């Protein structure tokens, strides 16, 4: 079916819930041994969370290889993203290597240090211009260059500097700082407003290693960024829009990391979003 129909024939008869259920038991099941492994266990937030082994992101080291990221590689809309959790006090600097070593130009983040009373990451990027970070697990240097905060999201200019080589490199820092504690936006106007700043600074594109993006456990409103940023480019891409199914598109990406959209309502949300954005894109 189409997407805007099928959507208001979803509610109407308010079957969310056995749509999204119907997601969760065709969705792949690959291994994760080494997320399991007894020597990662605090470079894991939660412990139902993992990457798959054939798709995780590994460090260029030879101790210990293991972070909590996957490549996530659509290959007919020619993107790729690299999903991961909000940092931990203790995998900071192996973030910022993986950055690095990936070539990442942008960094996505969908969350607040601080919700519902509790941390949800590590303050991992500086606050002061003034006041620089090193990381000397990983031998390199971070400063904030510039910042500018705005009504929905705050845009910062970062440097980042690989200590070994003195080389250094321009990071692009887009924190959506409105997500709600509870539940999904109302709208899907802000967010949407949002990708387009991503996309317009760069970030998504082949030119650039993959764009980083996290939320707290990587899976929920992560998922929701990049499922609505690739459907609304093959929207684009094909001669018939109205044959971008959603649901397929996920399933699609959930070979690459388990658990993407994590409940109903943000299915919903998702729908939404491609729904409105399929209008600005043309009127």
Do not use: C
């Given at each position: 079916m189409e997407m805007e129909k099928e959507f208001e024939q979803i509610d109407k008869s308010g079957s969310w819930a056995a749509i999204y259920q119907d997601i969760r038991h065709e969705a792949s099941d690959f291994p994760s041994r080494v997320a399991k492994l007894p020597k990662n266990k605090n470079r894991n937030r939660y412990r139902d969370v993992s990457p798959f082994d054939h798709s995780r992101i590994k460090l260029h080291?030879?101790?210990?290889?293991?972070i909590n990221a996957s490549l996530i590689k659509m290959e007919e809309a020619q993107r790729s993203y690299i999903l991961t959790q909000g940092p931990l006090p203790n995998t900071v600097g192996h973030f910022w290597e993986m950055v690095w070593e990936q070539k990442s130009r942008g960094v996505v983040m969908l969350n607040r240090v601080m919700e519902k009373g509790s941390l949800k990451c590590a303050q991992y990027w500086p606050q002061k211009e003034e006041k620089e970070?090193?990381?000397?697990?990983t031998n390199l240097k971070l400063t904030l260059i510039?910042?500018?905060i705005k009504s929905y999201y705050t845009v910062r200019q970062l440097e980042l500097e690989n200590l070994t080589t003195q080389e250094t490199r321009e990071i692009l820092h887009f924190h959506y700082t409105t997500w709600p504690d509870f539940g999904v936006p109302e709208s899907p106007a802000s967010?949407?407003?949002f990708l387009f700043?991503?996309?317009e600074?760069?970030?998504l594109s082949p030119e650039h290693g993959p764009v980083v993006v996290h939320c707290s456990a990587g899976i929920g409103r992560s998922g929701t960024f990049c499922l609505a940023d690739t459907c609304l480019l093959l929207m684009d891409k094909?001669?018939?829009?109205?044959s971008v199914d959603i649901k397929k598109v996920l399933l699609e990406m959930r070979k690459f990391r388990m658990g993407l959209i994590q409940?109903?309502?943000q299915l919903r949300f998702s729908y939404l979003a491609v729904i409105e954005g399929a209008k600005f894109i043309m009127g």
């Open positions: 080291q030879e101790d210990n290889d293991y970070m090193i990381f000397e697990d510039s910042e500018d967010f949407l407003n700043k991503v996309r600074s760069g970030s094909r001669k018939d829009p109205s409940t109903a309502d």
